Design a protein around this nucleic acid. Structure first.
Ligand SMILES: [Zn+2]
Lengths: 168, 47, 183, 142, 140, 344
RNA sequence: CCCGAAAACAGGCGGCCACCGAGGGCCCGGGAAGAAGACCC
RNA sequence: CUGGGGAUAACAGAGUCGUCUCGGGCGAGAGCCCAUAUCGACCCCGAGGCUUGCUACCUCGCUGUCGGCUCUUCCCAUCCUGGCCCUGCAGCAGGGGCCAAGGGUGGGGGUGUUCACCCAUUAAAGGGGAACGUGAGCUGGGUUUAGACCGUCGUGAGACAGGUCGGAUGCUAUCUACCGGAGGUGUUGGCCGCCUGAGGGGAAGGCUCCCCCAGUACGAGAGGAACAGGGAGCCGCGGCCUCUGG
RNA sequence: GUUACUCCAAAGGGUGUCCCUGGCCUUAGACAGCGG
């Protein structure tokens, strides 16, 4: 389908009301949580965006599948909790040509809008699978339209990424 | 047809899997492309 | 600026005579002379008390490297005039025995893989080649001369057209100045 | 006329000073032009001067940029570039210049000059090339 | 040597002139089913814009069979030229020419078909292909 | 698209009439034999012989057919010695010495000859030249030569030229020159039988010609022939660049060009118009003479093949500057027949 | 190999005149050259 | 038919690049096992302006055009020719990649064709730009007038980005540009002759086959090389008329 | 590079060099060589 540079940017009003949008599509990604959901893990590992992005559900489902397969074969289900935090509400538009007579896009897809320093995904994991958590994060970071950065939060919600990296 | 004398000087080489270039034996990255993936020159038929 | 005033000394042995003259080091010993030219801005070379001193008064990384490099070169020259350098090569053949000969300033290898045309490898001034059976010696007094001679003889016999897992014949280096070669 | 010995000197700075002289009304002779230096890297410099030699007018080469291959002409051409060439003033200033490879007998036995502002002494880098090297690369005599 | 005891080729010193271009009809002099042939190409020839390929005595050509017996027509064959009407110089300077344009049908590797050439043939053909002189009872 | 090579060579441009009728030799070969590196003559005609092949390649040892050009060469007169020194860019003349008693017909070319100039002054000037050559300021020595057409009856106005000498040294050259000045040179003293030569001359005039004949342009289709554009080319070029290029074939002068030709074998040098085969003495001039050239009287060369120019034109030969590695031997090949029949 | 002293540092050598006359052109008989001019004997 | 319009399309230009051609990152998985010999999904990031579209900034009497023939030149993202590296490279070969733009890249069948398809050869029979190079250079098959026929649509006059037959081709070169030929002035006195050679041009040469090496190395056998050495021809270039033809 | 703007390339990478920060080691540390 059509490139993602056409839908990256945020300079455009929100278009999230299905009781007025005729023909609005339906989601592809329908699973946002994985692994052991009831859990008390130690280390939290989340992607933050470096600038405002607009991420398609194609990309989200790609990320989901890849990361979950990787962690299922390298960690196991009872030892990781994987979550996607953002739902696609933004409807994307395309002009059906007539030319530029009556230009107003008919809907094709969905996207999630994300602002600077916002979380996208999260892997909760013990202390002896951090290597795998960070490999997962690399794989995910590789599939986004703009850049991203990760941290490592403790319970009590504190940043320990440095103290943890320096020792592993 | 064995000649260790010859193997030691034909087959102490690395190959980058990206550009194909040849690097010395103890390299850690390629000297052209910066790739970190280096394999050794096949000394026995693989396949 | 890693440091302030890097300097390194070289102890001079009994029979050797080192002397600098306009960015040109000259070394005399029990056999032969060896001169060379070591130039870099801010690097000095002199003799204080029986030593050779190399000095630089506020180095970056690429000055440190150059200074230790010059050190190695002058050590090489000293040990060369004092003992000399010796190299060994080996000859291997499956079919088509070849014959290696010296004549003047060349090394002629004939019947290599059945060729009707010989192969010529150059000798350099100050180096002596010596064939003894299937083993070859290259002796000399300048490290670089002896290495280049050995390497010319080895490169004389190179293949680019067929599999070298099956076609392995040639002449090979097996000791580069006392150190072996293993794989 | 003033006589200037290009030996250890930098080409562009030499030329700048000489061109101001010429315009202020003197006569200049340059000797040992093969011994001035050019700073940079060898590949870069050679590429530049080759790309210049192989410029020419596609319809008629009896026109055309006639960029030279000799050392004295390289020097003369730099100086020219530093003057108003499309003007009587500049043409006269340029006619007041003469450049030689070596030191002819005519000038032998005379005291030369050196421009302070141009000299290899200023440098901090061992990267320099000589105009004679450039000429040999391009295929010029001396 | 490698294999010379029984071979098919040889060297002539003359190199005759090229007089028979593409589209030319040659008679067949051998006792194969073919009677007439048309030249459609010349083996071992490279040319330029708008030029046709042309052959002379001793040259092999790719041909079509126009007239002949049913199992030979509309077939592509290879043939060696043995005669031509246009002249060509011999070493001593004298020049030579024949009465018509004839060919013998052969195999793509020199071995001939047939068993007898009715008529004379040129010496250069027989010098270049050593199995033809073994068939013809007149060589000049 | 379709590709073909361009029509004509850009290596013989500008294709213009020659600056002179007497040719010009720009470069000279590296010879060790101290001798004059060339000779000159007038061209007479063509004929053919039969010889046993001496040259490498099949056809060796057989009787073949060889066409031949006869070049008439009376002796030369040596009248000058000329020294060269090195200047800022290249060589430059330094001194000349001429001989005193020169023919009455040399003033047909050089009107202004000297007046007193006796042997006293000639020998003094020679001595000065020698005392200069023994110093060191000298780079090479050459000879000044003129032809003598009055011997064969062709003309009177002569040709004047400058030839070089073989060797790495200059004092050997000066000894040779000082010995040769004031006298005549014959071709046998200089050229050997069997040498390869380069021939140098000026070609025949054809006039103003069109591009079909002058560059090889293809004649156009028969509709254009009926339109008035058959022997014309189609395009002077494209829209951009918006000028005509110098590579586009046009009409102009065809012929009378200064040309050179490499590696022509000298077969025979004769004496007084006769060729002495192994067996018997024979003449070369055919029955009825040569067309447009009369009878041969003085001396002559056989040259294998063709050379540039019309019959009575001045030719200049030199030893080959660009020879191969597989040379034929230096000796008169076995000749079995020479044609004396009428060539008209 | 071909062109090339208009290469503006617009060259070098030898010789002849000038400080009446060195040389050159027209003209005449022709072509080995040629659209006029030029070129050659 | 008139009056007018680049206030407004088809045609080439400019702008843009969704589409287009040429690429890249990551590593799922496939490859006897082995993520990277080869392939590389899903997702993400780009170059060029040689397809097509969008817009409507220039031009409505400048010229309106497709293909072909002739002629010159350029880019490299390389088809052969030179040189190299990896291989799931024994040899013969194949696959994939690096440097390299000096030379070459042809002939024919049906069709108006460009492309595409087919034949026989060949070392190989690369792709693009130049106002979709080139009508003050030709042609004139197609397309867009006026004549007529068929099929559909229409009450009809009539239409069809549906088919078919037929259907005008102007110039004495003002300025520049190029090919060739002459006459002047200058070069600080005039004239003969002979030389240097700054610079500029060059493909002046490019390719293939045969013998031998050798039925050798390699290979279980089938099959089957290379360096050196000898010879011949094709394409291109420059000349000559003794021989042969006109 | 020698570009205020008019007219100028990315994701992805780098013991290229110059700097900040924080852990672990250290009078025998981190490579070597001699042996278990
Ligand atoms: Zn690589």
């Amino acid at each position: 389908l059509r490139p993602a540079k056409i839908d990256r940017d945020v300079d455009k009003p929100a278009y999230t009301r299905r009781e007025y949008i005729r023909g609005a599509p339906g989601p592809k990604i329908t699973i946002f949580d994985m692994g052991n959901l009831s859990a008390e893990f130690e280390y939290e590992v989340s992607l933050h965006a470096e600038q405002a992005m607009q991420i398609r559900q194609n990309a989200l489902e790609a990320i989901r599948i890849q990361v979950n397969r990787y962690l299922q074969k390298n960690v196991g289900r009872s030892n990781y909790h994987f979550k996607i935090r953002v739902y696609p509400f933004q409807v994307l538009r395309e002009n059906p040509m007539n030319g530029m007579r009556r230009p107003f896009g008919k809907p094709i897809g969905l996207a999630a809008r994300v602002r600077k320093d916002q979380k996208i995904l999260t892997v909760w994991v013990n202390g002896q699978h951090l290597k795998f958590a960070l490999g997962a994060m690399h794989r995910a970071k590789m599939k986004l339209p703009y850049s991203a950065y990760y941290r490592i939060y403790d319970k009590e919600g504190n940043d320990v990424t440095t103290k943890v990296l320096s020792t592993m | 047809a064995r000649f260790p004398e010859a193997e030691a000087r034909i087959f102490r080489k690395l190959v980058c899997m990206r550009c194909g270039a040849t690097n010395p034996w103890g390299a850690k990255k390629c000297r052209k492309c910066g790739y970190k993936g280096l394999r050794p020159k096949a000394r026995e038929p693989r396949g | 600026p890693v440091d302030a005033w890097i300097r390194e000394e070289i102890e001079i042995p009994e029979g050797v005579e080192v002397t600098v003259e306009g960015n040109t080091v000259k070394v005399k010993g029990p056999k032969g002379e060896l001169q060379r030219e070591l130039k870099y801005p801010g690097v000095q070379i002199f003799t204080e008390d029986g030593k050779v001193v190399i000095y630089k008064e506020f180095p970056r990384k690429k000055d440190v490297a150059i200074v230790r490099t010059f050190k190695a070169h002058i050590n090489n020259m000293i040990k060369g005039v004092t003992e000399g350098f010796k190299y060994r090569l080996k000859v291997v053949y499956s079919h088509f025995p070849m014959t290696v000969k010296v004549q003047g300033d060349e090394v002629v290898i004939e019947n290599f893989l059945g060729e009707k045309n010989p192969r010529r490898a150059k000798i350099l001034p100050g180096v002596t080649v010596k064939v003894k059976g299937s083993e070859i010696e290259v002796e000399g007094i300048d490290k670089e001369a002896v290495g280049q001679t050995a390497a010319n003889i080895e490169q004389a016999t190179r293949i680019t057209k067929w599999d070298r897992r099956v076609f392995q014949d040639g002449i090979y280096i097996v000791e580069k100045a006392g150190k072996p070669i293993k794989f | 006329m003033r006589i200037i010995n290009a030996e250890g000197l930098i080409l562009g700075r030499l030329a700048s000073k000489v061109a101001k002289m010429l315009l202020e009304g003197e006569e200049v002779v340059i000797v040992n032009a093969e011994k001035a230096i050019i700073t940079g890297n060898r590949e870069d410099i050679f590429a530049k001067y080759k790309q210049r030699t192989e410029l020419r007018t596609r319809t008629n080469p009896r026109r055309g940029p006639f960029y030279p291959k000799r050392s004295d002409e390289i020097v003369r051409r730099t100086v020219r570039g530093m003057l108003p060439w499309k003007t009587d003033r500049g043409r006269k200033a340029f006619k007041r210049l003469k450049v030689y490879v070596g030191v002819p007998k005519e000038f032998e036995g005379k005291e030369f000059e050196t421009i302070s502002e141009a000299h290899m002494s200023r440098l901090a880098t061992p990267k320099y090339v000589t105009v004679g090297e450039v000429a040999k690369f391009l295929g010029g005599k001396f | 040597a490698k294999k010379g005891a029984g071979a098919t080729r040889g060297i002539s010193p003359v190199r005759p002139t090229r007089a028979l271009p593409i589209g030319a009809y040659l008679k067949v002099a051998d006792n194969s089913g073919a009677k007439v042939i048309q030249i459609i190409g010349v083996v071992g020839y490279k040319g330029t814009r708008r030029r046709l390929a042309a052959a002379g005595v001793g040259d092999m050509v790719v041909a079509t069979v126009k007239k002949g017996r049913p199992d030979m027509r509309h077939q592509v064959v290879r043939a060696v030229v043995v005669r031509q009407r246009k002249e060509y110089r011999r070493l001593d300077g004298m020049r030579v020419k024949f009465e018509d344009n004839a060919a013998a049908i052969v195999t793509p590797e020199g071995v001939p078909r047939g068993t007898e050439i009715r008529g004379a043939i040129a010496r250069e053909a027989a010098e270049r292909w050593v199995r033809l002189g073994s068939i013809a009872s007149i060589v000049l | 698209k379709i590709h073909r090579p361009r029509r004509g060579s850009l290596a013989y441009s500008p294709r213009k009439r020659a600056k002179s009728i007497v040719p010009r030799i720009r470069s000279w070969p590296k010879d060790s034999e101290v001798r004059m590196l060339g000779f000159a003559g007038y061209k007479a005609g063509m004929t053919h012989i039969l010889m046993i092949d001496d040259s490498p390649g099949l056809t060796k040892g057989k009787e073949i057919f060889v066409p031949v050009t006869i070049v008439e060469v009376p002796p030369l007169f040596v009248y000058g010695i000329r020294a060269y020194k090195q200047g800022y860019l290249g060589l430059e003349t330094a001194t000349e010495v001429w001989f005193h008693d020169l023919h009455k017909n040399v003033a047909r070319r050089i009107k202004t000859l000297p007046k007193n100039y006796n042997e006293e002054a000639f020998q003094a000037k020679l001595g000065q030249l020698e005392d200069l050559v023994n110093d060191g300021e000298i780079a090479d020595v050459r000879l000044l030569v003129h032809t003598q057409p009055w011997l064969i009856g062709l003309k009177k106005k002569p040709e004047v030229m400058e030839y070089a000498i073989g060797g790495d040294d200059v004092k050997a050259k000066f000894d040779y020159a000082k010995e040769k000045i004031g006298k005549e040179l014959r071709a046998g003293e200089v050229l050997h039988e069997g040498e390869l030569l380069d021939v140098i001359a000026v070609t025949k005039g054809k006039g103003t010609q069109g591009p079909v004949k002058r560059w090889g342009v293809k004649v156009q289709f028969h509709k254009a022939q009926r339109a008035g554009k058959g022997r014309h080319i189609g395009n002077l070029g494209p829209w951009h660049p918006a000028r005509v290029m110098w590579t586009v074939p046009q009409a102009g002068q065809m012929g009378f060009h200064h040309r050179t030709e490499f590696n022509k074998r000298l077969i025979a040098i004769g004496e007084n118009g006769k060729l002495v085969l192994d067996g018997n003495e024979i003449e070369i001039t055919p029955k009825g003479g040569f067309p447009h050239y009369g009878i041969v009287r003085s001396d002559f060369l056989m040259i294998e093949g063709t050379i540039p120019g019309s019959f009575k034109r001045i030719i200049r030969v030199r030893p080959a500057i660009r020879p191969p590695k597989k040379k034929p031997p230096v000796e008169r090949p076995q000749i079995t027949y020479v044609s004396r029949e009428s060539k008209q």
